[PDB]
Design a protein around this nucleic acid. Structure first.
Ligand SMILES: [Zn+2]
Lengths: 136, 58, 155, 61, 111
RNA sequence: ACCUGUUGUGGUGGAUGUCUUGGCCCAGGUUCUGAGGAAGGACACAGCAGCCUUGCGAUACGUUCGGUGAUACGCAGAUCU
RNA sequence: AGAGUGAUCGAAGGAUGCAAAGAACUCCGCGAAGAGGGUUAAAAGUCCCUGAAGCCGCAACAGGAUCGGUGGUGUGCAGUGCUGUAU
RNA sequence: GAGCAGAUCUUGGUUGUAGUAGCGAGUACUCCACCUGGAGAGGAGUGGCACCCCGCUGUGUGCGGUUGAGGACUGGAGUGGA
RNA sequence: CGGUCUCCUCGACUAGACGUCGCUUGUCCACGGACGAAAUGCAGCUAAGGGAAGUCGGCAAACUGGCCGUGCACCUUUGGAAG
C-alpha cells in the first residue's frame, strides 16, 4: 500500500535524447574561420601555423571550416548536433566565473587512434623519407 | 527413475496369446492364462463380474 | 443455397465468387478483405501485389493485438499492420475467379469495384499438441469461407 | 527422389558408396530412365556414372 | 527508352568486408551472397540476378567467417537470350580473379 | 477505423418437434448342449469383400432334398420360364 | 473402436428424396471449388427431416470520456408498429 | 421419471484470452541446372496499339525435390555395417 | 534432448578406446527470414586499484594443472601421509 507503482520508482525505458541545459560553461577561445585564417589554432608557443582540425579530421565529422568556439568541458549531445548557447543565467562571482582565459596550446593530434604528432609536418620530420614519399 | 525413463526398459512379455480364449492373457513364465486359466479343464469365471461372463457366454 | 449476404440492384451488373474451407487463417483474411472492401478491381489487385512485395501493408484493426507497428500503416490512419501472405494469395485467387465470372457475364472487370467482400469462420479442424506434465491440447486450424461481389461502376 | 534409386544401384555396382558416385548432371534424363542394375551398368560403361577417387589423407607431413 | 533497360557489361569491385563486419561468423558467407544480390540489383536495376557457381565458390573459398574482403565482379546485364515472352533483361554476375585490386576502378566492356 | 447496440443476412453449432427393424416390463410355454466331441477361440473360404453375419469349413456367404414358383441385383457373367 | 502386462475397463454413433431422378452441359481455374445451367414439389446435395441458444462475419441504421454503468423512474427526441376514429 | 441459474452439478458445443505465448540442445548452409499449373515471380501493370509489336513500370533475400560445384558435420565407445 | 541387448571398429598428436582434427561410411535434418540485433534473460568471456570489505556461509568463478630432475614436514596402525 499504496496498491499502485508510483512515479518515483525507477523503471526501465528511454535513456538519452532528453532536453538538457548545461549551465556555466566558460568560453576558452573564439577562433576565426579556417578559410580566412589558416592559423586559427596557433598559440603563443606554436611555431607552425595550424588549424583546429586535427590530423585525419574530426572523427565522424570532418574539417572545421567556420568560426569555432572552445567551450570548456563537455556539452550535451553528440557531434553534428545543434547546441543553442545562451548567455549565462545562474551567474556567480568566483574567479572561476570572472576569470580571463588564454589558451597556450591546442592539441590538434589525431583523435582517430593515438596521435603522437600535432602537425603533418611534425609527422614528416619524425618519420622522414618513407617508401610512398620517396615514390612520389 | 519411475516414469518416462523406466518405460523404456519395458520390453518383454508377461502374457501371450492363449489357445482357449485367444486373449493375450496367457502368462508365459507360470504357464497359466490370466483370463480362462487354460491348463485346468474348467473355464475361469467368477460371479463378481457379470461383464466378464457376458463377454464369453454362449 | 449459393446465398450471399449482399442484395444487388441489378445482378446483371455484378460478378460473384465464393470460397469454402479455404484453409487460411481467418483473422488475417478478415483484415485483408476489410482493407480491400471498397477498392476498385485495379486498385485491389495493385494493392495485393504491393502487400506481397511488402511495399505497403495490411492494417490489423480488430484482430491485431500483439501485431507489430509499421510505417506502412499510415495509409489507413493506423499503426499496426502486417503482410499476410497466404491470405493475400487466397484472396487473389478469389478475386481472379470473380473477374473470370465478370468476363463470362460480359462485363468489363476493370470498370467494376469490390462491393461486399466478406469472410466467415469455417469448421475448425483439430490436431493434437503435446504439453508438459503429460497433457494434450488442441491445434484447431481456424479456416474461412470467402465471398466477393464486384459491381460495375456507376457514373 | 529424383536419382536416388540410380545412386543406390551405382553405389552397389561400384563398391564405393553413394557419396563417391558421380552422376552426370548433363545426362540426368538418361540416368533417370535407368530403372535397373543392368541399365546402371550400361551407364557406368558409358561414363555418365563415375566412382570418384577417394579423397586424400596425405602422409608426407 | 532508358539505358537502364539495355544490355550492359560492367566490371566492378564489391568490397565484402564492409558487408561481413560484426556479422555472425556462421552466417558471414550467406550474408555476403545476399549482399552481392542486393549490390547487383542496385547497380544493374534488374530483379533477375544470377550468381555464377565459380563466384559462389570464390565467396566460400574461406568457408563461412572467412569471406574475402572484396571480389572483382563482372555484371553482364543480358537479354533473356531465349523466350516467347517480353524483353526481361537479366544479369549474370561472375567472378574475375585479379590478384591485385590496385587502381582497379569500375570499367565498362566495349564502351 | 475501433467499440456498443438493433435489425437483415450468412456461417459455426446440433437444441427442439415428429417418428423408430431398439430397449424395458408383465404373462404363457420350453429348457431341447457334450468324448458320436459342446460353449468358446483361431486360421481359412466370395469374379470384384475389408468389416459384420446364431454365414460357412478344403463339398468352405455354400452340397442333397422338400415347400414356393420368376427372380437376384452395387457392378458386370452364363444359367433359368 | 479404444485403453491396460493383465485381472478387467469400454464408448461416440438414427432420419436425402415419392422415386437416385445422386447434379448433364458451359465459362474460369492445376485442381478443388466458384459463376451459370439443370434434377426435383423443393435442394432435401450422399456433411443429406427441421435447424434453437451461445458465438462469429457482413451491410444498414443509432450512439460512443467518466459505476455519470446494467436495471428502475418520469418525460423528451428519432425510427417503428398497433387500436380506435365525429360531421 | 411432471417446471432449474447455481449443486468445484452431468453430457455436448462454444467464447475471450489470441493471431497471443510460443514452434531457440544436437555448429550450416550457398550457387547454377532440371523437375512445375505457377516458382528469375504482375491479372486483364501502364502509354502508344489496334491481338502482334515498340516503350515504360513493379517483383517478397523467395515453396518442394534431385544431379553437379563449393562449405561444413559424423570422426570407428560413429550419424557406419550386422 | 529420456530409456533400451550384443558384435566389428581406420590415420595424426597423445600414456591413451581421454581430448582435438582427418580418409572410408553416412549426413546437412532439426520452422525459417530480415534488422547488428532495445531492455531483460539463459550461456561464453574479459576487466583497472583493492582482494571476502559481498554473503547464513569464499556460494559461483578464479588460481593450480601433463611430463622430467632435485626434493619433501608433522603425525603414523610403520603400510602411509605423499603428487
Ligand atoms: Zn486363456
Amino acid at each position: 500500500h499504496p496498491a499502485r507503482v508510483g512515479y518515483t520508482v525507477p523503471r526501465a525505458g528511454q535513456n538519452g535524447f532528453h532536453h538538457r541545459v548545461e549551465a556555466n560553461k566558460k568560453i576558452y577561445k573564439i577562433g576565426k574561420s579556417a578559410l580566412v585564417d589558416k592559423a586559427n589554432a596557433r598559440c603563443e608557443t606554436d611555431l607552425t601555423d595550424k588549424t583546429i582540425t586535427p590530423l585525419g579530421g574530426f572523427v565522424r565529422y570532418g574539417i572545421v571550416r567556420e568560426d569555432y568556439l572552445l567551450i570548456k568541458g563537455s556539452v550535451p549531445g553528440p557531434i553534428k548536433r545543434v547546441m543553442t548557447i545562451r548567455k549565462a543565467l545562474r551567474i556567480k562571482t568566483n574567479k572561476a566565473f570572472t576569470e580571463e582565459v588564454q589558451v597556450k596550446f591546442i592539441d590538434t593530434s589525431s583523435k582517430f587512434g593515438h596521435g603522437k604528432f600535432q602537425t603533418r609536418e611534425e609527422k614528416r620530420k619524425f618519420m622522414g623519407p618513407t617508401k610512398k614519399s620517396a615514390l612520389r | 527413475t519411475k516414469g518416462t525413463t523406466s518405460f523404456g526398459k519395458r520390453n518383454g512379455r508377461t502374457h501371450k496369446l492363449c489357445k482357449r480364449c485367444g486373449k493375450r492373457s496367457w502368462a508365459v513364465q507360470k504357464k497359466r492364462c490370466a483370463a480362462c486359466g487354460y491348463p485346468n479343464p474348467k473355464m475361469r469365471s467368477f460371479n463378481w463380474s457379470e461383464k466378464a461372463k457376458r463377454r464369453n457366454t454362449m | 443455397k449459393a446465398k450471399y449476404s449482399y442484395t444487388p440492384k441489378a445482378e446483371a451488373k455484378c460478378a460473384k465468387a465464393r470460397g469454402t474451407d479455404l484453409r487460411v487463417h481467418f483473422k488475417n483474411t478478415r483484415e485483408t478483405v476489410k482493407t480491400l472492401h471498397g477498392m476498385t478491381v485495379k486498385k485491389a489487385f495493385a494493392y495485393l501485389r504491393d502487400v506481397l512485395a511488402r511495399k505497403r501493408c495490411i492494417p490489423f484493426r480488430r484482430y491485431g493485438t500483439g501485431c507489430g507497428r509499421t510505417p506502412q500503416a499510415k495509409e489507413f490512419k493506423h499503426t499496426r499492420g502486417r503482410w499476410p501472405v497466404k491470405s493475400v494469395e487466397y484472396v487473389q485467387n478469389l478475386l481472379k475467379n470473380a473477374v473470370a465470372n465478370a468476363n463470362t457475364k460480359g462485363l468489363d472487370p476493370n470498370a467494376m469495384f469490390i462491393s461486399h467482400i466478406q469472410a466467415n469462420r469455417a469448421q475448425q479442424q483439430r490436431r493434437r499438441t503435446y504439453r508438459a506434465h503429460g497433457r494434450i491440447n488442441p491445434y484447431m486450424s481456424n479456416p474461412c469461407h470467402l465471398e466477393v461481389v464486384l459491381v460495375t461502376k456507376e457514373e | 527422389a529424383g536419382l536416388k534409386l540410380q545412386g543406390r544401384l551405382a553405389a552397389a555396382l561400384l563398391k564405393c558408396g553413394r557419396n563417391r558416385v558421380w552422376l552426370d548432371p548433363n545426362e540426368t534424363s538418361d540416368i533417370a530412365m535407368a530403372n535397373s542394375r543392368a541399365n546402371v551398368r550400361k551407364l557406368i560403361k558409358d561414363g555418365f556414372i563415375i566412382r570418384k577417387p577417394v579423397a586424400v589423407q596425405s602422409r608426407a607431413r | 527508352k532508358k539505358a537502364k533497360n539495355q544490355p550492359l557489361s560492367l566490371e566492378t569491385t564489391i568490397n565484402l568486408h564492409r558487408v561481413v563486419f560484426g556479422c555472425t561468423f556462421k552466417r558471414r558467407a550467406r550474408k555476403a551472397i545476399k549482399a552481392i544480390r542486393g549490390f547487383v540489383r542496385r547497380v544493374m536495376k534488374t530483379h533477375d540476378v544470377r550468381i555464377d557457381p565459380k563466384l559462389n565458390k570464390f565467396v566460400w573459398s574461406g568457408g563461412v567467417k572467412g569471406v574475402p574482403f572484396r571480389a572483382r565482379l563482372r555484371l553482364d546485364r543480358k537479354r533473356s537470350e531465349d523466350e516467347d515472352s517480353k524483353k526481361k533483361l537479366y544479369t549474370v554476375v561472375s567472378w574475375v580473379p585479379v590478384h591485385d585490386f590496385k587502381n582497379l576502378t569500375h570499367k565498362k566492356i566495349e564502351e
